[PDB]
Design a protein around this ligand. Structure first.
Ligand SMILES: *[C@@H]1O[C@H](CO)[C@@H](O[C@@H]2O[C@H](CO)[C@@H](O)[C@H](O)[C@H]2NC(C)=O)[C@H](O)[C@H]1NC(C)=O
Ligand SMILES: *[C@@H]1O[C@H](CO)[C@@H](O[C@@H]2O[C@H](CO)[C@@H](O)[C@H](O)[C@H]2NC(C)=O)[C@H](O)[C@H]1NC(C)=O
Ligand SMILES: CCCCCCCCO[C@@H]1O[C@H](CO)[C@@H](O)[C@H](O)[C@H]1O
Ligand SMILES: Cc1ccc(Nc2c(F)cccc2Cl)c(CC(=O)O)c1
Ligand SMILES: Cc1ccc(Nc2c(F)cccc2Cl)c(CC(=O)O)c1
Ligand SMILES: *[C@@H]1O[C@H](CO)[C@@H](O)[C@H](O)[C@H]1NC(C)=O
Ligand SMILES: *[C@@H]1O[C@H](CO)[C@@H](O)[C@H](O)[C@H]1NC(C)=O
Ligand SMILES: *[C@@H]1O[C@H](CO)[C@@H](O)[C@H](O)[C@H]1NC(C)=O
Ligand SMILES: *[C@@H]1O[C@H](CO)[C@@H](O)[C@H](O)[C@H]1NC(C)=O
Lengths: 551, 552
């Protein structure tokens, strides 16, 4: 019924109903004009030719290794390139934010209510004839069919980039601070009202939860010592709410910032490391500031660990993931002379993009064991038996699964994968091609172009019929990867602007915050600017074992 | 004990202790360096001579009327000048915000916790020997003696700029959407978590309160008809909580967005006008979009009224208040190629600056009556008696009081005026001169330089002794006014950046929002861009009386 159901407005033009069967496109500042914002202005047509494809840019960044080696050691050049990466990506994101699951038009409710995930593309209206608008059948294909035909893992496909379990568990730990779905309200809602890197997965979302986790001396967090090793305190001791089955022994009911980190020993591993890191920084700051109280030591440590997290995410985590030969740099100063909004709202699609279910291995190899999923879930005793040292060494060696390329989702989490499809439809996501156009990508013209092969493409075609009806989430997993890479084009071009906007959008990246005195002097500041995934383990893991995000 | 109690660092340098008796100044991006950030870098001293004093700039905008008459009719030149007005002010404000009443250092708690008012200057530490840091006596002078000697009104001093009660009540109505003190937590806390012009004083702070105020038909708000006139609904039939004394009959307990707007008939007047305006726009939008449901009609009307408010504040309200001959312009497009943060956090000092108690008259004159404060308080029957037309006409004619100049706080609200002093001390405000330096002003060297006279200057020196111990709030009410103006330098120079930041910082001023389609098309868009205080009254007050923010 809604005339905007076909998504007629192109090039990020805004559709508005002007009657019962009439619409108008707002091409304001789109660089286009006309009824559908399809007719390019003069300067627009020029930029369209000079601007290369994402695959071309990706190729350059992943080749000419010797050339980039020169670039990386030239500060002025490295800064200029990183600056371009930051600016060009962030312009894809609406900031301040616009739509959510309940509003396909802008409203104060959609802007002010922080309980919502925001939306890069508005939902398909309720009165639309088809789930994707007007294209496709009355109903999308069976989610179970799609899951089994092109998603479920037949044989474990390893990651050509060699991402290890240290990478996988960092990804889940890191992103669990801003993807906290409020299942009470629905998939379009979040409990992470901070909408970014606040480290609530360490310090708790609320003040009362924080205060229960704090020692209230020397700025430190509460902890217990088992076998000489520092671990998070217990539920019984702190009285913070954690999610554990009732049979878990008291000393194994670890109390941490995120209530679900007791689900996975891998998550509790990083939880322990960051806990130790916080208290380590507390020791450092106190030595520098013996005149400081417990409150200032705690708050200053937190700001430092926020910095450390962002530093590691960019220069180690993303650096590995991208496959670039360019040395990515975390440097807030790059944006000081640029137009940039220091704020962020977590996008529902970014949560969807991050559903990297194929990442998970068949078994979790630790030391000389090979635990299954049923053995791994809610079993922190594995963490205590082997210790952090053994965990780091084991997880650095074990390879993870390939996300794109189709047919690699372990059946142990098939219910979760199916839910990603269902909840995407429930939230009325637009199609793959509409999201591709939203991020300046060419729409696929066939399922074979999408997957790069014939077998899976044929199964998809029998299911969806029209390529313009292909869903975003399943496509991400079946997409034709980049040459010897973990991801396809769509995963990167969509996720990277969500990511960098959330990293650099942090208030500690703003010029008033990005000062040494903010972090307790040059000593605190250096901890941030020298942070790495290696030093974090070296500075929290016994014996200081080697580690990286690849095998 | 804290080695930063003396406020040593200057030019917005940040002080940090390094020992029990040692401090270091962070001069990053200040343009200065040295131990106390007082050594100007090469490019800095250059601008130090190229930058005119705020009094000079004010002189230019308040003179050469014939010249501005030429400038105002040249769109390029007008926009360019207005562009300078917006940018030069907003750079004084920390955005994202920094300190609050409990944090004199940056912390995630101070940033993330929206229940705090933010602070332009950090609080004086608790372990400091004196309230101002190290200067002055162990305790500040008696607030009662300060109030009585230099603040209390002997004889009414009318505003030389001719501000009326329409202005006075608009100020109180408009600002009480973001100045909503959480008295249960303290004077440094707020209940306005929107921290800006969200119009919660019309629609309600919470979704729950909003829904009870809504008709859920044609996007409209609930209303009742009394004598053929549209008024807000009652507490009885909406169940929204309002603050009323128990002797007020339920039929007179009007329910609106802000729970305290029943306190003053002048507030309830604007609440009605804005209620009517909302439903007026819903009618207009429905005509343009018969295919729209109730929810989109309500929401789109809210964005438009937000636009209307900001438009009127700038082009009418601030326009009159500033005294500028230059025509101020509400144009979000002016900031699209400028570095600007579309976000705002309400500053505790902005609230303190807006305690315009001397604005209040001795009596509230409606038609032929002269209601005292006791009679005017919580008396909505006065509104139903005279009406809205007579209210607008009467308030347009009655002049308001001069804020600066000293001794003009009416006695009826002396307790409130004393609270403003005491709570500033409770929140550990830094001195007047510290706030002047914080906003690129020159510190006063004597109380005489502050007041511009001798009698009150002698009173204050006997109380404060040192000029560097003079408090911010009492100074604003006794400061030497600009030539025939309502305010002194400190008021305008401190407040204007807070204001423009909160106005332009609204998300609807951002490029993705500032589109016709955001407001339902060109018809809705035009309501914003042609709004004014007169049209607001004309479309919603019977008879369309002639109104203004000043008397003839
Ligand atoms: C954000 O939006 C949600 C969803 O509309 C609000 O939650 C609803 O609140 C109303 C009344 O407050 C209830 O009747 C609904 O049952 C709630 N729905 C859900 C799914 O929880 C929420 O109150 C809004 N938040 C704010 C701060 O306004
Ligand atoms: C913002 O800060 C205030 C003040 O610290 C917090 O209010 C305190 O909350 C704790 C824990 O719930 C209570 O024990 C205190 O009694 C409260 N004090 C006051 C003065 O209200 C408030 O919870 C914080 N807000 C958020 C969202 O964390
Ligand atoms: C791993 C368990 C999935 C089996 C689900 C039912 C089989 C449907 O999946 C079929 O799988 C075959 C094996 O890969 C493919 O050759 C076919 O293309 C596919 O249709
Ligand atoms: C869904 C997704 C997409 C991209 C990235 N990172 C990334 C990448 F994989 C390539 C280039 C830049 C960036 Cl920021 C990430 C990882 C992250 O930055 O959170 C996730
Ligand atoms: C305490 C205070 C200070 C200044 C103003 N307005 C104002 C002014 F009075 C002169 C120049 C610009 C502006 Cl924004 C105001 C009114 C307002 O913009 O809300 C209050
Ligand atoms: C705009 O799109 C509609 C529907 O997609 C189409 O019918 C029409 O021809 C288009 N107009 C132009 C000028 O491209
Ligand atoms: C938990 O892990 C231990 C290994 O430390 C294993 O022996 C035990 O069977 C596991 N328990 C469950 C319920 O999987
Ligand atoms: C800096 O300030 C301190 C205390 O205010 C003072 O003693 C010192 O002389 C100052 N130094 C300079 C270089 O201004
Ligand atoms: C309220 O106003 C009326 C005039 O309408 C007046 O007669 C009455 O005395 C007032 N009430 C009080 C308590 O002063």
């Amino acid at each position: 019924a809604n005339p905007c159901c076909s998504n007629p407005c192109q090039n990020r033009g805004e559709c508005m109903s002007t009657g019962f069967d009439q619409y108008k496109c707002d091409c304001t500042r789109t660089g286009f004009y006309g009824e559908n914002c399809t007719t390019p202005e003069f300067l627009t047509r020029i930029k369209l030719l000079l601007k290369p494809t994402p695959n071309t840019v990706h190729y350059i960044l992943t080749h000419f290794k010797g050339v980039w080696n020169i670039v990386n050691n030239i500060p002025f050049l490295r800064s200029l390139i990183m600056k371009y990466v930051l600016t060009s990506r962030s312009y894809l994101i609406d900031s301040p934010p616009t739509y959510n699951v309940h509003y396909g038009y802008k409203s104060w409710e959609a802007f002010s209510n922080l309980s919502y995930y925001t939306r890069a593309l508005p939902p398909v209206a309720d009165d639309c004839p088809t789930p994707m608008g007007v294209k496709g059948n009355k109903e999308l294909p069976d989610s179970k069919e799609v899951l089994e035909k092109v998603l479920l893992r037949r044989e474990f496909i390893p990651d050509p980039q060699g991402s290890n379990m240290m990478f996988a568990f960092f990804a889940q730990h890191f992103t669990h601070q801003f993807f906290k779905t409020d299942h009470k309200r629905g998939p379009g809602f979040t409990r992470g009202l901070g909408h970014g890197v606040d480290l609530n997965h360490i310090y708790g979302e609320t003040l009362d939860r924080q205060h229960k986790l704090r020692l209230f001396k020397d700025g430190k967090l509460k902890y217990q010592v088992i076998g000489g090793e520092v671990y998070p305190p217990t539920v019984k001791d702190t009285q913070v709410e954690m999610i554990y089955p009732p049979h878990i022994p008291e000393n194994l009911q670890f109390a941490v910032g995120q209530e679900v980190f007791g689900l996975v020993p891998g998550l509790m591993m990083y939880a322990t490391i960051w806990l130790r890191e916080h208290n380590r920084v507390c020791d450092i700051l106190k030595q520098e500031h013996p005149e400081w109280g417990d409150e200032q030591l705690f708050q200053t440590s937190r700001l430092i660990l926020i910095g450390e997290t962002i530093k590691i995410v960019i220069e180690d985590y993303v650096q590995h993931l991208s496959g670039y030969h360019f040395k990515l740099k975390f440097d807030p100063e790059l944006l000081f002379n640029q137009q940039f909004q220091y704020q962020n709202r977590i996008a529902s699609e970014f949560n969807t993009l991050y559903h990297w279910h194929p990442l998970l291995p068949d078994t979790f190899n630790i030391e000389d064991q090979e635990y299954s999923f049923k053995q791994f879930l809610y079993n922190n005793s594995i963490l205590l038996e082997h210790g952090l040292t053994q965990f780091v060494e084991s997880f650095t060696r074990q390879i993870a699964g390939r996300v794109a390329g189709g047919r690699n989702v372990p059946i142990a989490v098939q219910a979760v994968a199916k839910a990603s499809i269902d909840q995407s439809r429930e939230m009325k996501y637009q199609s793959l091609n509409e999201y591709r156009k939203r991020f300046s990508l060419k729409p696929y013209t066939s399922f074979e172009e999408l997957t790069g092969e014939k077998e899976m493409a044929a199964e998809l075609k029998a299911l969806y019929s029209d390529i313009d009806v292909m869903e975003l989430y399943p496509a991400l997993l079946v997409e034709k990867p980049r040459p010897d890479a973990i991801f396809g084009e769509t995963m990167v071009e969509l996720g990277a602007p969500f990511s960098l906007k959330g990293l650099m959008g942090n208030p500690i990246c703003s010029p008033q915050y990005w000062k040494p005195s903010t972090f307790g002097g040059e000593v605190g500041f250096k901890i941030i600017n020298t942070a790495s995934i290696q030093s974090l383990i070296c500075n929290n893991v016994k014996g200081c074992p080697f580690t990286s995000f690849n095998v």
